[PDB]
């Protein structure tokens, strides 16, 4: 039918922030209050339209809990984009953002590091409590290499579809995407 390609997204962030919940919300439009610590690293795939192009996104969910961050087995190499996710109500998860983005670059080590797609999701905004300010997070994202930032709510699906849309477009606008099966 039409041309197809694949992108590889690596979602990172401290244990708790909502990475697993953000991914499920996007991929299966489902959520659950019942937590379930993610160990190791796993992934999903979803296909959506991206300007007459049919892109299949390989979304990797990772472990935020240090005592499970086992493998790390360069399953990062593909990564056409990296999603830095934190808990808006939990300030530390925002503090350590540099830990992750850095860590990513060191592992992945993508050509043209100063332009690699990064999307920052400020999760759980659906809670009254809130220790990190949008402006703050904003001031930070731009401050990097003007990477987009989205306040999200894996729970009430705020900007989940929207976040991944941009996640899809920046990774794609980087020419790194792999073709699929089109003889």
């Amino acid at each position: 039918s039409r041309k197809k390609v694949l992108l590889k997204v690596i979602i990172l962030g401290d244990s708790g922030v909502g990475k697993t919940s953000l991914m499920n919300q996007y991929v299966n439009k489902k959520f659950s209050n019942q937590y379930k610590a993610t160990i190791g690293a796993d992934f999903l795939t979803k296909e959506v339209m991206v300007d007459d192009r049919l892109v299949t996104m390989q979304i990797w969910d990772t472990a935020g809990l240090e005592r499970f961050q086992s493998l790390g087995v360069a399953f990062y190499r593909g990564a056409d984009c990296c999603v830095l996710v934190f808990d808006v109500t939990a300030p530390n998860t925002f503090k350590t953002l540099d830990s992750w983005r850095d860590e990513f670059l060191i592992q992945a080590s993508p050509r043209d590091p100063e332009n690699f797609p990064f999307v920052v999701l400020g999760n759980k905004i659906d809670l009254e409590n809130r220790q990190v300010a949008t402006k703050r997070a904003q001031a930070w994202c731009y401050s990097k290499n003007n990477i987009p930032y989205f306040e999200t709510s894996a729970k009430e699906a705020i900007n989940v579809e929207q976040a991944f849309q941009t996640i899809a477009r920046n990774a794609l606008k980087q020419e790194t995407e792999v073709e699929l099966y089109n003889e």
């Binding site: 039918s1 197809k4 190791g40 690293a41 796993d42 992934f43 795939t45 390989q58 086992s70 493998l71 087995v73 399953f75 699929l180 099966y181 003889e183």
Partner: protein
């Protein structure tokens, strides 16, 4: 705690990946089937409904479902 943990997992990934790709190759060939390499429509669909049908069967006894 199992030290070999980085094994089943790492394989779980590999296989999940394969299963994705094989899925491509199929629909690929399945399409390349009704290309100018022509052959009935609705049928090629039943073929699917045939395999997917047989699949359930075999797979089931494979995993002891």
């Amino acid at each position: 705690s199992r030290e070999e943990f980085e094994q089943i997992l790492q394989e779980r990934n590999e296989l999940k990946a394969k299963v994705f790709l094989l899925k491509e190759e199929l629909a690929y060939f399945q399409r390349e089937l009704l290309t100018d390499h022509r052959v009935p429509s609705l049928l090629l669909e039943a073929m699917k409904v045939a395999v997917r049908k047989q699949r359930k069967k075999i797979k089931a006894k494979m995993l002891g479902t």
